[PDB]
């Protein structure tokens, strides 16, 4: 009996961490509509439904959302697929041309600056001999002045030929479910109070991740996953300031963003089978786009995040907010997309407060670019086409991204400023539950039995 | 309504259980280990990584005594300096995750001993069927 013999055991539950490519799959209702309505109707598989989320007991797997993988490769995959949805579309190489711009028909005041210009220019036709004088409406941010007369050109002409988005494809989020291949598994922290670092007492394996809708947003991440009961702030090292502070609050704040202009698009032929979608006339009042949140719910959620930020910074601490210190337009304020058009909507109205240790609404104004330079490449831009009619959408603000200032010299107040920066902090706010492991069978163990001859 | 034993019999359902109780279900972990325009290459190399790793594991079984037994008695004694634990404490105390860290340091000695044992068994069986 004391002569213990070894025996191998194949198919043993034991794992280590690993880094592998995962596999996307979206819901079958997105597959009910067909043929490149949005991206990855062909690049992903339809899911096997009701994925096996089975509980796993007596287990303590340490997680880490900050050195996590699958947020790195998702940030690679969405950029690469964003590029893969632009190859069939129209290049705006023939449109880099001298523009003869003028002010739009509107009551004009010298102090005020119009956000739109009325630009006429020569453009080629179906016939290479003939050309046409045609006009469009542009924003101030898309044109620059080249230098009496007043003639303009587009901003991106000196650095990159631009690509119109195809109006057939849409930009709306469809939820991805990331699935592990054969020989791996996805663990999920089912714990409630979990800052994303260290032990999670209740983990559970799962076939595929839950619905991850991809939102593009710099500050104030939208349509996200709410917390269970508390408001949880999350950081890699809170005493450091260069690392962002991902806030996730429980009750969502409804935001209503709109564009009160009534645009008319205008198909301009460039060549054979080439259509450039410009802006025709404005029908109605020339107004400025904006977003609305409720004052009461926003002050309530700021009270919640002050109550939760005082857990790390003392109870006798003044906490105040500010607007952004500076940078490019799509990091000083929160950018998003609403029905296919990009907003850069100022947030100095929200983040102005200070807090002591004891049916209204906010109208905050937006801007609209038509070209974009997402993820800041070297020779890539996207001319987003205009869309018909008055546009509005409704979204639930779910979380925040904050940044502390490096306050030396006996700083009692600890001011917090928003900042987007990397897109991955949007993505890390949804993969905080998930990690990937590699199944390693062929366990070996001693027991009391001996193989005969 | 699902029952605790039903999710016990799922994939990785016994990772916190004792290894004596986890030994009753090994076919589940062994089964969800094989099956489950540019992206086809990525999924294709994932599938061939899965089948190639499964073939490496089945070959490491096959060079030992057992090809498809899934529980393999063999004939090298457990050197008690490897773990110095009692029998009934390891089959009723620890999981498999807790055991692997205890034997991660003493491994690739065990695999070479198994290959030596199988080579010795094959030459002894060759001699036995030779004199018959």
């Amino acid at each position, epitope marked *: 009996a004391e002569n213990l013999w070894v025996t191998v055991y194949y198919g043993v539950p034991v794992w280590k961490d690993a880094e592998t490519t995962l596999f996307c799959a979206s819901d079958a209702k997105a597959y009910e509509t067909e043929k490149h309505n949005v991206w990855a109707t062909h690049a992903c598989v339809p899911t096997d439904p009701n994925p096996q989320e089975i509980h796993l007991e007596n287990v303590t797997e340490e997680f880490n959302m900050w050195k996590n993988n699958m947020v790195e490769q998702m940030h690679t995959d969405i950029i690469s697929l964003w590029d893969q949805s632009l190859k069939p579309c129209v290049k705006l190489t023939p449109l880099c041309v001298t523009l003869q711009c003028t002010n739009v028909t509107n009551n004009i005041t010298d102090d005020m600056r119009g956000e739109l210009k009325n630009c006429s220019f020569n453009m080629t036709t179906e016939l290479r001999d003939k050309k046409q004088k045609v006009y469009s409406l542009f924003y101030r941010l898309d044109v620059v002045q080249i230098n009496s007369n007043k003639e303009y050109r587009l901003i991106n002409c000196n650095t990159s030929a631009c690509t119109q988005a195809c109006p057939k494809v849409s930009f709306e989020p469809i939820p991805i479910h990331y699935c592990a291949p054969a020989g791996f598994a996805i663990l999920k922290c089912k714990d409630k109070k979990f800052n994303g670092t260290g032990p999670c007492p209740s983990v559970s394996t799962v076939q595929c991740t839950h619905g991850i809708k991809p939102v593009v947003s710099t500050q104030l991440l939208l349509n996200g996953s709410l917390a269970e009961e508390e408001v949880m702030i999350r950081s890699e090292n809170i005493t450091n300031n260069a690392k962002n502070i991902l806030v996730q609050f429980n009750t969502p704040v409804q935001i209503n963003c709109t564009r009160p202009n009534n645009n008319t698009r205008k198909s301009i032929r460039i060549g054979p089978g080439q259509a450039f979608y410009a802006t025709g006339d404005i029908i109605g009042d020339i107004r400025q786009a904006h977003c609305n949140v409720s004052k009461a719910t926003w002050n309530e959620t700021l009270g919640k995040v002050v109550k939760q930020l005082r857990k790390h910074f003392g109870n006798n601490t003044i906490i105040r907010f500010a607007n952004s210190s500076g940078g490019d337009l799509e990091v000083t304020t929160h950018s998003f997309n609403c029905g296919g058009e990009f907003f850069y909507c100022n947030t100095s109205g929200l983040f102005n407060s200070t807090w002591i240790s004891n049916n209204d609404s906010i109208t905050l104004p937006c801007r609209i670019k038509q070209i974009i330079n997402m993820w800041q490449r070297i020779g890539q831009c996207m001319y987003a086409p205009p869309i018909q009619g008055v546009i509005r959408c409704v979204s639930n603000i779910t979380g925040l991204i904050l940044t502390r200032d490096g306050g030396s010299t006996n700083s009692t107040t600890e001011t917090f400023r928003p900042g987007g920066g990397d897109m991955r902090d949007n993505w890390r706010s949804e993969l905080y539950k998930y990690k990937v492991v590699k199944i390693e069978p062929l366990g070996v163990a001693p027991t009391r039995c001996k193989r005969r001859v | *309504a699902v029952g605790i034993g039903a999710v016990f019999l799922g994939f990785l359902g016994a990772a916190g259980s004792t290894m004596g109780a986890a030994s009753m279900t090994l076919t589940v972990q062994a089964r969800n280990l094989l099956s489950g325009t540019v992206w086809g290459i990525k999924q294709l190399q994932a599938r061939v990584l899965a089948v190639e790793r499964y073939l490496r594991d089945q070959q490491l079984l096959g060079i030992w005594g057992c090809s498809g037994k899934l529980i393999c008695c063999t004939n090298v004694p457990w050197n008690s300096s490897w773990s110095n634990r009692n029998l009934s404490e390891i089959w009723d105390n620890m999981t498999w995750l807790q055991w692997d860290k205890e034997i991660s340091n003493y491994t690739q000695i065990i695999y070479g001993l198994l290959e030596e044992s199988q080579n010795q068994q094959e030459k002894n069986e060759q001699d036995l069927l030779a004199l018959d």
Partner: antibody
Amino acid sequence: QVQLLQSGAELVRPGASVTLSCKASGYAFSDYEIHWVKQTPVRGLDWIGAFDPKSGASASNQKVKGRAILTADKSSSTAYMELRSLTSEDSAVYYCTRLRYFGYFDVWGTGTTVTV
Amino acid sequence: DVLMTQTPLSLPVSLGGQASISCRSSQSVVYSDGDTYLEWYLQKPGQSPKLLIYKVSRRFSGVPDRFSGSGSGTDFTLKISRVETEDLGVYYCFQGSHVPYTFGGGTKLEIKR
């Protein structure tokens, strides 16, 4: 016949240990599970956990985790408890129950009013 | 935690009147078999809790032709035609979907007066 014979009332001082017994009868005992439900009049219905008689599986949720160890004698068909250092909030009406694999709660115990 | 919410809490309903109890989950109740596991219950003072419905609308044998469950996904609702003295007491929602299991918050049915 279709019963879950529990113990009586249990007047147990705090700081001690508490056991239970579900001396069920009527059917096969391997094929049916044993779960455990609390009744407080404050919250309503709460959980402890589960013991699987076939596989030997058992679990307990996080509030009762660190205290409860679920064992059973399959021959005498008696479930058990090991509660450790309860409070007055743990004073509640406990219930041995049964489940099937992919079934539902057929039988219901009488309720042990453990008051501490 | 797939913590359940019951709305409303109290329901004074005259005997013979109608009553309906709503429940909401924080996740989907769907298990891998496709059958979401919801169990509507009973409780009377001085007695053990008992079954009413062990699935979406598949009631337990011993229930008359008045009780029915309904709903989808995360939002579910009970339906009773006529309220009896036997139909009084506290009712409950429950998930048998996946570990950990959760109950509701209890709904007391009383009589209008």
